[PDB]
């Protein structure tokens, strides 16, 4: 698979995020309880609430497709569908909204990915969501300063940074500690206070952000300079136009 055209670092990073054979760099280690705490759908050690009975307790209709498509564990169990949502600063956050959705549906099964200017979301079975969330939080998908976990009040992707380089958060779920140089998540994605904050590590250096970012910018790599990437987008525009008319 080629995934995406272009000869810039951005284009390559976009290809890497989609390529399931590319190993996302692990930049931090997060405990399973911390993931459950960040998600905020249940308490650590709380039973998985069920939206419907287990699939084996149900008698699904004989259906060649059902028999050929292995359900994810959370669907077998009847888990609810919950979410994790990220905001990505346009100031060189490693992951961006379109990059996420494309990469999610290349990497993860049974994924409902949504892309917006200030938020990107995935909904799936709860227990499966937690393992996806661990990777999305531990790897280069996420930077503790230029990315934020936000179930609501996502304002900030387009705002200026604060004095510490942190992205704006109306609810301040992620607190930069000027005494230690590390970021802590005081509250959960929906904004509810946590009992024990979650260390999210040190923000990436400005130089490393540009190394890993997937956004084009004039003060980084400009999209207009990735001529081959622009050319494919124009090609798609032209071929779409000709197909819709189809009377040449």
């Amino acid at each position: 698979a080629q995934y995406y055209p272009g000869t810039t670092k951005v284009a390559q990073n976009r290809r890497n995020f989609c390529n399931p054979e590319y190993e996302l760099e692990k930049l931090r280690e997060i405990s399973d309880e911390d993931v459950v705490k960040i998600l905020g759908h249940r308490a650590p050690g709380e039973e998985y609430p069920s939206v419907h009975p287990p699939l084996e307790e149900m008698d699904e209709p004989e259906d060649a497709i059902r028999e050929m498509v292995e359900p994810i564990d959370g669907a077998k169990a009847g888990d609810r569908v919950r979410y994790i949502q990220f905001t990505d600063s346009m100031y060189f956050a490693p992951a961006q909204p379109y990059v996420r959705s494309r990469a999610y549906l290349c990497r993860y099964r049974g994924a409902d990915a949504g892309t917006l200017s200030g938020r990107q979301i995935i909904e799936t079975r709860e227990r499966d969501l937690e393992k996806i969330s661990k990777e999305l939080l531990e790897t280069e998908f996420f930077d503790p300063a230029r990315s934020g976990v936000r179930g609501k009040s996502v304002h900030g992707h387009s705002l200026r940074l604060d004095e510490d380089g942190m992205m704006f958060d109306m609810l301040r779920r992620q607190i930069y500690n000027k005494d230690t140089g590390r970021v802590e998540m005081v509250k959960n994605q929906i904004g509810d206070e946590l009992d024990e904050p979650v260390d999210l590590g040190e923000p990436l250096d400005e130089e490393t952000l540009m190394e890993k970012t997937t956004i084009y910018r004039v003060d980084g790599e400009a999209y207009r300079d990735d001529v081959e990437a622009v050319e494919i987008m124009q090609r798609i525009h032209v071929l779409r136009s000709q197909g819709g008319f189809n009377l040449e």
């Binding site: 359900p71 669907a75 569908v81 409902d112 799936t124």
Partner: peptide, 8 residues
């Protein structure tokens, strides 16, 4: 199919 949930 893998999700057994239509929303996606």
């Amino acid at each position: 199919g893998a999700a057994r949930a239509a929303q996606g």
